[PDB]
Amino acid sequence: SIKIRDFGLGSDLISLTNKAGVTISFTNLGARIVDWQKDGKHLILGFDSAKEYLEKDAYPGATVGPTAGRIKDGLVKISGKDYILNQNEGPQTLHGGEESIHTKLWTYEVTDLGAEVQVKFSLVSNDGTNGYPGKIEMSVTHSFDDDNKWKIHYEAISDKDTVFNPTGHVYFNLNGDASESVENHGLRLAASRFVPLKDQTEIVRGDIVDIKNTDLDFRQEKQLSNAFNSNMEQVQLVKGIAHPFLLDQLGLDKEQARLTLDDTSISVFTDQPSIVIFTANFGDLGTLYHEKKQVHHGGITFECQVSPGSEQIPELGDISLKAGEKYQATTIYSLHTKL
Amino acid sequence: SIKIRDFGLGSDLISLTNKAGVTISFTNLGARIVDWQKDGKHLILGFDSAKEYLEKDAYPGATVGPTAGRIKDGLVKISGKDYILNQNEGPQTLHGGEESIHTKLWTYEVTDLGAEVQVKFSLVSNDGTNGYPGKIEMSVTHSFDDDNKWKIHYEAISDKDTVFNPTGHVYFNLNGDASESVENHGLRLAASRFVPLKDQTEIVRGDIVDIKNTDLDFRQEKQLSNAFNSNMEQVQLVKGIAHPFLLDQLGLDKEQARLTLDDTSISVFTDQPSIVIFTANFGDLGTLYHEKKQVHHGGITFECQVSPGSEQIPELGDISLKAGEKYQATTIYSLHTKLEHHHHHH
Numbered sequence: 280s281i282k283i284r285d286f287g288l289g290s291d292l293i294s295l296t297n298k299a300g301v302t303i304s305f306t307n308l309g310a311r312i313v314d315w316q317k318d319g320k321h322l323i324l325g326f327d328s329a330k331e332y333l334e335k336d337a338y339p340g341a342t343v344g345p346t347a348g349r350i351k352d353g354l355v356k357i358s359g360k361d362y363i364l365n366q367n368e369g370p371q372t373l374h375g376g377e378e379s380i381h382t383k384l385w386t387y388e389v390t391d392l393g394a395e396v397q398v399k400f401s402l403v404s405n406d407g408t409n410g411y412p413g414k415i416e417m418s419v420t421h422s423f424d425d426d427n428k429w430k431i432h433y434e435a436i437s438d439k440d441t442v443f444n445p446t447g448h449v450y451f452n453l454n455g456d457a458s459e460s461v462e463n464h465g466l467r468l469a470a471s472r473f474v475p476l477k478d479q480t481e482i483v484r485g486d487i488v489d490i491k492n493t494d495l496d497f498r499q500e501k502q503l504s505n506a507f508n509s510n511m512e513q514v515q516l517v518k519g520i521a522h523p524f525l526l527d528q529l530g531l532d533k534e535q536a537r538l539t540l541d542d543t544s545i546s547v548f549t550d551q552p553s554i555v556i557f558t559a560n561f562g563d564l565g566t567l568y569h570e571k572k573q574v575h576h577g578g579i580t581f582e583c584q585v586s587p588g589s590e591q592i593p594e595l596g597d598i599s600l601k602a603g604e605k606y607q608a609t610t611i612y613s614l615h616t617k618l
Numbered sequence: 619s620i621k622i623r624d625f626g627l628g629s630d631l632i633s634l635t636n637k638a639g640v641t642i643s644f645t646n647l648g649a650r651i652v653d654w655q656k657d658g659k660h661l662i663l664g665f666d667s668a669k670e671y672l673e674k675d676a677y678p679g680a681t682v683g684p685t686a687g688r689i690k691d692g693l694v695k696i697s698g699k700d701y702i703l704n705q706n707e708g709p710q711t712l713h714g715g716e717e718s719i720h721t722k723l724w725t726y727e728v729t730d731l732g733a734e735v736q737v738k739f740s741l742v743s744n745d746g747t748n749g750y751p752g753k754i755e756m757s758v759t760h761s762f763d764d765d766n767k768w769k770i771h772y773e774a775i776s777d778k779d780t781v782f783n784p785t786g787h788v789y790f791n792l793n794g795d796a797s798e799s800v801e802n803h804g805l806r807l808a809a810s811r812f813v814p815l816k817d818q819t820e821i822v823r824g825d826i827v828d829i830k831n832t833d834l835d836f837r838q839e840k841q842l843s844n845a846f847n848s849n850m851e852q853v854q855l856v857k858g859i860a861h862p863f864l865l866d867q868l869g870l871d872k873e874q875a876r877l878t879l880d881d882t883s884i885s886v887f888t889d890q891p892s893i894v895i896f897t898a899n900f901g902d903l904g905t906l907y908h909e910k911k912q913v914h915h916g917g918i919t920f921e922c923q924v925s926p927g928s929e930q931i932p933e934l935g936d937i938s939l940k941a942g943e944k945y946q947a948t949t950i951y952s953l954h955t956k957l958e959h960h961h962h963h964h
């Protein structure tokens with residue numbers, strides 16, 4: 280079933296319940312996932328109204344872009360020309376700059392295909408918005424099926440050469456409660472390398488590092504506590520995890536990561552080359568989710584995209600988007616329950 | 619009473635009924651007026667869903683900006699600096715550029731004050747959007763009261779020195795049917811001068827002209843047919859009216875314009891210095907409104923703003939907006955019955 284309701288400030292809440300009784304809901308405010316629940320438990324972090332997102336934290340579950348992550352000094356080179364983007368975190372451009380696409384109300388259309396339902400959100404980023412050349416017509420389609428697969432498919436076209444590398448900012452928490460650390464979840468991740476950060480500004484250090492046999496090697500399922508109690512300087516630097524992991528094998532058919540807690544597991548699939556993992560290292564902040572005070576490590580993201588820092592480490596990839604080319608990306612979160 | 623429902627594509631339709639039973643409705647897609655009825659008759663033009671606006675004509679009833687009208691070659695000078703804005707009408711920047719504010723979903727909040735209900739729409743124009751320095755935090759408040767007054771109040775603040783001069787693009791048609799020309803309406807307008815256009819591209823000519831005693835003189839009420847039938851070069855140029863009228867006396871307290879049909883009148887009040895009037899000179903385009911094919915002259919706007927062309931005719935005004943300074947504008951459309959005797963035939 281599909282249900283549409285007012286979510287506040289003019290935004291809508293679109294809730295989809297599949298044949299299995301699983302419920303997933305989205306809002307056009309930022310083409311974002313709001314909730315995902317099974318047997319009355321939430322699997323992800325989310326708020327109860329639009330206002331909350333705007334007052335508390337606008338990132339959770341949102342589509343961020345045009346470029347996800349931090350860009351040093353807000354500087355990009357397009358066709359050999361330097362362009363300065365909106366700087367909203369010190370001199371860096373973080374997640375597209377201030378008041379980006381995650382704070383806008385996107386238009387949308389729902390398409391019911393029976394076993395699958397799609398919600399297609401659309402937005403035009405005007406030429407010059409936050410310094411980005413355009414216009415860029417973007418659409419993000421969130422879909423949910425009877426096999427419990429939540430899929431995100433992005434598409435974009437720009438009238439001018441530009442940059443584009445959006446991501447989905449959902450935070451998972453299989454405890455179903457933000458006041459409980461994800462340290463107890465098990466994580467498996469098909470990455471042998473990572474991108475270290477320079478310092479507390481979170482810009483990239485400049486190199487690529489092999490993590491085989493370190494506290495960050497999750498090639499074999501392991502509990503998060505491990506990484507959390509690690510003394511690796513990188514872990515210590517951010518107080519948890521806040522890094523881009525380079526996937527070993529690219530392709531949508533491969534399960535790139537898996538997050539497990541008891542009989543409940545989440546598998547991640549993507550056509551992107553990297554996954555940025557951030558473990559809600561908020562310390563004492565105590566953001567309130569569903570009246571529950573959030574704890575440090577009270578959530579974890581799987582931001583699939585081209586690794587941030589390619590401006591400094593070209594090997595990472597290239598996020599350019601030439602005028603007229605059609606950008607496409609796909610990320611899938613599959614829910615499984617052991618029997 | 620206040621009512622809200624989905625209007626399509628994620629937009630909402632907010633419908634207000636005052637104590638006198640007059641209903642008016644708006645949508646957050648473009649902070650726009652959708653309909654205004656009295657006794658079951660449409661007083662303005664509008665569509666029945668959001669998609670129509672996007673597919674047929676996105677301007678009707680919209681809030682347009684950041685700058686309303688045409689800016690020659692999309693060039694403005696801001697604090698000694700030249701800025702080129704998005705050019706979407708040939709080399710001109712028309713109503714803020716392509717995919718402007720009228721095409722976005724604004725957030726909103728409704729405030730019920732009893733005899734008056736306010737709908738405040740908000741939106742941020744990011745810095746550099748369509749070439750405009752910002753960011754610009756905008757808000758448009760549409761309100762309706764028990765006195766049949768529809769008021770539009772604009773507010774804005776910019777992080778940077780920029781330009782700002784938005785307007786409301788409502789189209790009136792007292793016939794309540796787009797297929798009926800407004801040549802049968804009576805018009806009174808407190809303006810002695812107008813701004814002629816250079817040519818078909820519709821940029822300003824460079825001069826201000828006195829219209830007293832011409833077919834464009836509506837200081838004293840006259841039927842619109844008078845203008846429509848005129849062979850004045852300017853009328854012929856645009857096939858009707860499509861010009862800025864300079865108000866003779868400024869001030870929100872003065873009735874600047876009045877449009878009448880039989881027992882119904884609409885009075886226009888504003889704090890702006892001019893009114894751009896466009897009479898739907900679409901020829902045989904025949905856009906469908908409520909399944910009625912719109913006729914040439916099947917509608918009229920009263921866009922209250924600083925006249926377009928100030929880039930060329932400084933006398934017209936200054937639309938610049940200094941960083942941190944608060945912009946405000948107020949325009950009011952008021953509805954009356956039996957305000958005067960208007961009994962004609964066409």
Ligand SMILES: OC[C@H]1O[C@@H](O)[C@H](O)[C@@H](O)[C@@H]1O
Nearest residue numbers: 336338374448481521557560
């Ligand atoms: O991705 C968004 C997040 O990035 C992290 O690295 C920061 O520490 C968070 O405060 C921020 O909300």
Ligand SMILES: OC[C@H]1O[C@@H](O)[C@H](O)[C@@H](O)[C@@H]1O
Nearest residue numbers: 675677713787820860896899
């Ligand atoms: O105000 C916008 C309008 O400008 C007029 O001068 C044009 O002829 C119309 O096509 C357009 O919708």
Ligand code: NA
Nearest residue numbers: 291624629630
């Ligand atoms: Na809605």
